[PDB]
Nucleic acid binder design. Structure first.
Ligand SMILES: [Mg+2]
Ligand SMILES: [Mg+2]
Ligand SMILES: [Mg+2]
Ligand SMILES: [Mg+2]
Ligand SMILES: [Mg+2]
Ligand SMILES: [Mg+2]
Ligand SMILES: [Mg+2]
Ligand SMILES: [Zn+2]
Ligand SMILES: [Zn+2]
Lengths: 169, 97, 43, 176, 162, 80, 38, 222, 191
RNA sequence: ACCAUAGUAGGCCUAAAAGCAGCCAUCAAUUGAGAAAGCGUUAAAGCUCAACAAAUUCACCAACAUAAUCCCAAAAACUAAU
């Protein structure tokens, strides 16, 4: 004869075990699994202040400045990147980086949809007012493995050879 | 970048990647170019010369690596994965070098 | 090798004899019969 | 070999700690570095401590780049208080105006740190104001006429606070 | 399908990718509304280790598994099909999906024991020397538990441990 | 090693920024010379999350700083 | 090797692998981190 | 590229003085001179007191019954104090000090001769009762992380829950009870005395509904 | 180990008192025989020399500044408590061995001779004799407790008396085991 | 996978406290990085995290040895079972 409460789990009577087994919980099982079922309609995303600011900045960049060069961003050292920034600001041309997730839709909606293959990997936008490509070509020639992908000079989409020809012009 | 940095790239002379950015199959080529142009690879050895040739009508991305075993590894990468190109390049340079 | 301490169905450590599907079905049938009985004993 | 950051007083150049072990581990002769420092800082005699970067090459040769002096010492000299507040935010260490912050920013714009960046002087002013916030020195927008009375009251307040702190430190030392 | 070809010509290595033609899906699925391939072809709760024609559709030529992000199956069916492929490989099905080793096929070993519905690996299960008594018995697992939801025409539950 | 100031010099100019040999202290130029960006900026109370405009980059910078603070607080139980 | 009932990584380079029907925390940088699930 | 999400901010919550757990005596200041019978009903059955949050946001919820003594109290106090930041967190108890005496035979080991001698005191705890309640300017993740050790070291099974977690688990239990498929349930059968099951059941089973057996509570028994 | 509650009797024997007596004896023996025989020529560090100050005993390193002039020369200095110089000199002169110092003012030169006398065997024998005397004292205490029990053996059951005797015997065995362990540790330290 | 630059050694005590025995502030530069969430130095230095740029399968807890003469019916995952 054991007490009402024990430590050995107090193995129950056979009738009580049968009662527990019969009264065991049975979850509701739907006829068709809803995971792979035609999904519910789209819960549309809401535009945030960050993406709105990115769109506004990209629009301002594409409106104000003239030279918009697209280059392949190369993972270089911080000191070299800052030195390149200083050398570019000596000629007064700046650089920017924008995420592809917001850059691609704006580019395909705008008139610069021809630059989509240029923005697959790492990207860098060289922004210059009153373009002077000679100094940019000279400063890019100093680094061998940093290639100019293309860009637009006053609504004129050009490749690397086009940029070289324009600088020589 | 870490795999190339830890493999000892001191035994390479020239690496050139010739590609056309306006094509539809240059993602892997540009990924390989960025991986081989990482700062760790640059600081591993300064005697190597890295060249990025940009074309418009070439339409055939390729990578040529000349190293001091008198060896020229040419990879015409138009459909290969960037990771596959990286691992094949690493396996070849470690085996011969 | 494996011994059951004490008597088989008395001690603190009893036989782990489980419940069977036949017993479950029998209990369900008896429950249904008693539910019908208690329904007929309502009005 | 590497790079070492050293904050050294303008008029002080000693072949000892903490400058001793750092150069001794690198193997660079301390006397040559001291002579170079004296030659490069003998054109300055106000004793303003400055940070510098020593680039030790593998061949035991060193290069020196001297930047602008310390912002904390700049703020201390501008405010007239020898040491900053122990508990920032709870007590006031000093009082300056926008003129001192602008002057410090325009004289520090030539340092090796902010020379590479091309931001205007506004960012440097913001950095100086943040450093003053950390130091505990209060800045005011316009108190040119009241700065004399503000100084004459804050000097008395600060000397009273210093006396109280000295008494508390003496009591703590006696109790310990 | 993409194939990597390596050419050696005078200390020169050429690595090229070649694209070959691949078979496509049948035009008429019974349930076009289903997102999942098996769930739309109505093979859910139908396949087993015996059904080799379905398991062989997506497996590497060396017997390897295929990524779900490429296949498109739901997670449960992906796990079930992985289990079925492992069971078939251990049982001896898919004879042509083994790597070709010219050096290792000459030294023959002991004949392969016939097996099926094997759950664990043959080289990882130690023999049960005790085997347990009637009340406490170490039952021998047969088949994968992920296949307990298959249709049972007889209606008897599948004995996963015997 | 140097010496500080005390008289009207502190209010009338800065006597610790003069860096070279000659004691040529710079004078305090009139208020008209200093542009507006010196006076428009806040000094004492730092901007809070609710004070800033959500359509401004400073708000998102502060939000990133708060995210880093939250991550640091959560990662205080590192067993590695 | 240390036989344990519960395995946990003692550093970021420990990897868990199922071998011989058991679980093994293997570490290369620190060989003392070899753990075997019993 | 990933979006930026706002972080929770805690300013209304104020840290009270002495946020650390207070010390607890091994024995009450007034010892129980009279030896009392060890009633097991103080452990058996669900808890009716200290089952809800009063001022904190996180709690240690006990899923079973047992006895807590000075060793467990000291372990919990030391662990929480050493793993808790007093500047941003505060903690409080929810169970009283050990007051129920436990007697050991001692002199002579043969059965009989009278009651034994009082050895130590314990605090009876039922399933579903909070043990330690914490709050402050902290997130639940670290609190759960450093309270899981205390929950494991407690004799009865325990979890580090919050207000949201407790509400979610209660609603899940209610939903499971609501949508249970089989028409036969322990509560219904016990109430209806079907099959004469009252002969093998217990009078307290009518209230336990099969979810409680001795000191053990099964949350998935509906 | 049969241990009674030690609270159900409380009147015919005080196990708490017996344990207190045993622990006091153990501690006194330990401290005395250690500090007496821990000399081993060089008693660890000579910084622990008891010098009288304010009618109390403090170590040399406590009331002194002790340095090492030479590996065999201890240099004491009287700066912390420069008022017991004579007492410190006397204590150094007679500290276990013949450590005669030189009174060079505040400085004190202490040569370290000997460390070759091989008197450790005699010290071990003395420690064994002291341990035996302590065992005899413990046996006397146990006999006093047994005599108290016998005096109480009037109405109290001899079953309870036997239980208490077993408890006292267990405590005595534990204490003598502790004494033997201390003797072994001291023997190892000496040799 | 992907990388890590700036005021600055933020201010006090300590021989030293440079993100790291301790206390108080926790600002501000680059689109993009916390007076620093883990290792490490006597103090540094240095190695990792989260921040941008590159993608975006799923990813919260849950696994635990043993006795003595010799293991213990054999076996079976689908022909229709209230
Ligand atoms: Mg009974
Ligand atoms: Mg029997
Ligand atoms: Mg039994
Ligand atoms: Mg437990
Ligand atoms: Mg910034
Ligand atoms: Mg990171
Ligand atoms: Mg063992
Ligand atoms: Zn599916
Ligand atoms: Zn490890």
């Amino acid at each position: 004869g054991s007490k009402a409460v024990t430590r050995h789990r107090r193995v129950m009577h056979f009738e009580r075990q049968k009662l527990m087994a019969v009264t065991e919980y049975i979850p509701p099982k739907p006829t068709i699994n809803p995971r792979c079922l035609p999904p519910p309609p789209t819960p549309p995303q809401e535009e945030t202040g960050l993406v709105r600011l990115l769109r506004r900045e990209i629009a301002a960049v594409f409106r104000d400045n003239r030279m918009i060069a697209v280059c392949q961003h190369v993972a270089l050292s911080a000191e070299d990147k800052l030195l390149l920034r200083h050398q570019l600001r000596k000629h007064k041309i700046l650089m920017k980086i924008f995420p592809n997730q917001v850059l691609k839709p704006f580019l395909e909606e705008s008139k610069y949809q021809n630059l989509l293959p240029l923005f697959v990997g790492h990207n860098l936008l060289l922004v210059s007012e009153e373009p002077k490509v000679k100094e940019m070509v000279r400063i890019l020639k100093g680094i061998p493995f940093l290639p100019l992908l293309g860009g637009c000079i006053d609504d004129t989409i050009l490749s690397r050879q086009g940029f070289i020809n324009y600088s020589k012009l | 970048a870490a795999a190339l940095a830890r493999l000892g790239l001191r035994a390479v002379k020239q690496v050139r990647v010739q590609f056309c950015p306006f094509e539809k199959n240059v993602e892997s080529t540009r990924t390989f170019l960025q991986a081989v142009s990482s700062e760790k690879v640059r600081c591993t050895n300064l005697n190597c010369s890295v060249i990025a040739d940009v074309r418009h009508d070439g339409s055939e991305p390729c990578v040529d690596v000349l190293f001091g075993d008198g060896h020229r590894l040419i990879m015409r990468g138009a459909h290969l994965t960037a990771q596959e190109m990286l691992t094949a390049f690493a396996s070849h340079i470690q085996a011969r070098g | 090798r494996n011994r059951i301490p004490g008597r088989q169905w008395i001690g603190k450590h009893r036989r782990p004899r489980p419940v069977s599907a036949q017993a479950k079905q029998n209990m369900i049938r008896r429950l249904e019969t008693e539910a019908e009985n208690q329904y007929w004993l309502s009005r | 070999s590497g790079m070492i950051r050293a904050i050294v007083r303008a008029g002080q150049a000693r072949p000892g700690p903490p400058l001793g072990p750092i150069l001794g581990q690198r193997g660079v002769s301390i006397n040559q570095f001291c002579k170079e420092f004296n030659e490069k800082t003998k054109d300055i005699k106000e004793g303003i401590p400055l940070p510098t970067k020593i680039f030790v090459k593998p061949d035991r040769t060193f290069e020196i780049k001297i930047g602008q002096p310390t912002v904390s010492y700049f703020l201390k000299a501008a405010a007239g208080i020898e040491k900053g507040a122990r508990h920032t935010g709870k007590e006031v260490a000093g009082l300056v105006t926008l003129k001192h912050v602008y002057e410090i920013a325009r004289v520090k714009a030539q340092d090796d740190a902010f020379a590479l960046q091309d931001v205007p002087l506004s960012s440097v002013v913001r950095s100086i104001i943040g450093s003053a916030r950390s130091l505990g020195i209060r800045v005011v927008k316009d108190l040119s006429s009241e700065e004399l009375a503000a100084f004459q009251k804050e000097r008395a307040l600060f000397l009273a606070a210093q006396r109280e702190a000295d008494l508390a430190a003496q009591a703590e030392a006696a109790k310990k | 399908f993409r194939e990597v070809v390596e050419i050696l010509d005078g200390k020169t290595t050429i690595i090229e990718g070649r694209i070959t033609e691949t078979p496509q899906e049948s035009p008429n699925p019974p349930n076009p509304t289903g997102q999942c391939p098996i769930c739309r072809w109505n093979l859910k709760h139908k396949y087993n280790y015996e059904d080799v024609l379905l398991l062989s559709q997506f497996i590497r030529p060396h017997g390897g598994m295929l990524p779900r992000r490429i296949t498109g199956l739901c997670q449960e069916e992906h796990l079930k099909i992985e289990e079925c492929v492992k069971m078939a490989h251990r049982a001896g099905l898919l004879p042509n999906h083994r790597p070709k080793l010219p050096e290792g096929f000459v030294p023959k070993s002991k004949p392969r024991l016939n097996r099926y519905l094997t759950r664990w690996s043959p080289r990882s299960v130690k023999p049960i020397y005790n085997k347990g008594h009637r009340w406490n018995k170490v039952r021998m697992p047969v088949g994968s538990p992920l296949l307990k939801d298959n249709v049972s025409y007889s209606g008897r539950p599948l004995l996963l441990y015997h | 090693p140097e010496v500080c100031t005390d008289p009207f010099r502190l209010t009338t100019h800065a006597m610790g920024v003069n860096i070279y040999k000659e004691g040529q202290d710079v004078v305090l130029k009139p208020d008209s010379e200093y542009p507006e960006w010196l006076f428009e900026m806040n000094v004492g109370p730092p901007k809070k999350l609710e004070e800033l405009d959500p359509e401004t980059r400073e708000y998102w910078r502060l939000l990133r700083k708060h995210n880093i603070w939250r991550h640091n607080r959560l990662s205080k139980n590192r067993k590695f | 090797f240390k036989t344990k009932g519960v395995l946990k990584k003692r550093c970021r380079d420990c990897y868990l692998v199922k071998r011989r029907g058991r679980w093994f925390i293997y570490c290369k940088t620190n060989p003392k981190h070899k753990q075997r699930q019993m | 590229f990933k979006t930026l999400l706002p972080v929770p901010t805690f300013e209304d919550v104020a840290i009270p003085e002495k946020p650390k757990l207070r010390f607890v005596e091994r024995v009450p200041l007034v010892p129980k001179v009279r030896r009392e019978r060890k009633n097991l009903s103080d452990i058996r059955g669900p808890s009716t007191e200290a089952t809800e949050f009063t001022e904190g946001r996180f709690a240690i919820l006990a899923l079973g019954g047992g006895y807590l003594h000075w060793g467990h109290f000291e372990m919990m106090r030391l662990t929480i104090n050493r793993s808790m930041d007093p500047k941003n967190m505060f903690a409080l108890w929810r169970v009283p000090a050990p007051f129920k005496p436990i007697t050991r035979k001692g002199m002579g080991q043969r059965m009989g001769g009278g009651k034994g001698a009082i050895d130590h005191y314990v605090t009876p705890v039922k399933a579903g009762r909070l043990i330690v309640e914490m709050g402050g300017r902290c997130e639940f993740k670290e609190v759960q992380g450093f309270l899981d050790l205390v929950a494991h070291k407690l004799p009865f099974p325990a979890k580090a829950v919050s207000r949201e977690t407790l509400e979610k688990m209660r609603k899940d239990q209610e939903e499971r009870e609501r949508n249970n498929q089989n028409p036969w349930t322990f509560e219904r059968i016990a109430t209806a005395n079907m099959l004469g099951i009252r002969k093998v059941l217990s009078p307290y089973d009518l209230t336990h509904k099969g979810r409680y057996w001795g000191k053990f509570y099964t949350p998935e028994r509906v | 180990r049969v241990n009674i509650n030690a609270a159900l009797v409380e009147d015919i024997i005080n196990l708490e008192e017996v344990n207190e007596e045993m622990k006091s004896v153990i501690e006194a023996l330990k401290d005395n025989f250690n500090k007496t025989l821990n000399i081993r020529t060089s008693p660890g560090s000579l910084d622990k020399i008891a010098v009288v100050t304010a009618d109390g005993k403090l170590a040399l390193n406590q009331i002194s500044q002790i340095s090492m002039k030479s590996p065999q020369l201890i240099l004491v200095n009287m700066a912390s408590f420069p008022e017991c110089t004579a007492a410190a000199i006397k204590a150094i002169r007679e500290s276990g061995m013949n450590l005669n110092p030189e009174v060079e003012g505040t400085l004190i030169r202490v040569p370290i001779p000997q460390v070759t006398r091989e008197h450790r065997e005699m010290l071990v024998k003395l420690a064994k004799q002291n341990t035996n005397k302590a065992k005899d004292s413990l046996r006397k205490v146990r006999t006093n407790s047994m005599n108290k029990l016998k005096k109480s053996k009037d109405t109290v059951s001899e079953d309870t008396i036997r239980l208490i005797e077993k408890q006292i015997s267990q405590m005595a065995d534990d204490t003598v085991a502790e004494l033997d362990r201390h003797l072994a540790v001291k023997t190892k330290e000496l040799l």
